Amino acid sequence: KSCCPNTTGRNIYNTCRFGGGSRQVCASLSGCKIISASTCPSDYPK
């Protein structure tokens, strides 16, 4: 999972992922937080 601001972020992540990106790049594209588990900090887990 990731910590996105909202369902919109998932959009950016998708545009990137499906665009030919990665996780870090995607993260920097949606501004979400890349978690290495099934949890998430106080960084809007959306």
Q: How would you describe this protein?
A:
The chain is mainly alpha-helical and 46 residues long. It has one domain: Crambin, CATH 3.30.1350.10. The chain is 39% helix and 9% strand. The protein is built from 2 helices and 2 strands, in the order βααβ. It has a two-stranded antiparallel ribbon with strand order 1-2. Helix 1 crosses helix 2. The radius of gyration is 10 Å and the shape is globular. It is classed as toxin.
The CATH architecture term is: 2-Layer Sandwich
The CATH class, by name, is: Alpha Beta
Order of adjacent strands in the largest pleated sheet: 1-2
At the fold tier of CATH, the topology name is Crambin
The total of beta strands comes to 2
Query: In angstroms, what is the radius of gyration?
Result: 10 Å
The helix content, as a percent range, equals 25-40%
Secondary-structure element series: EHHE
Specify the CATH homologous superfamily.
Thionin-like
Percent in strands: 5-15%
What's the story with the biggest beta sheet?
A: 2 strands, antiparallel
Q: How many domains make up the coordinates?
A: 1
End-to-end Cα distance:
9 Å
PDB class: toxin
Keywords: thionin, viscotoxin, Viscum album, toxin
Assembly: monomeric
Entry title: Solution Structure of the Viscotoxin A2
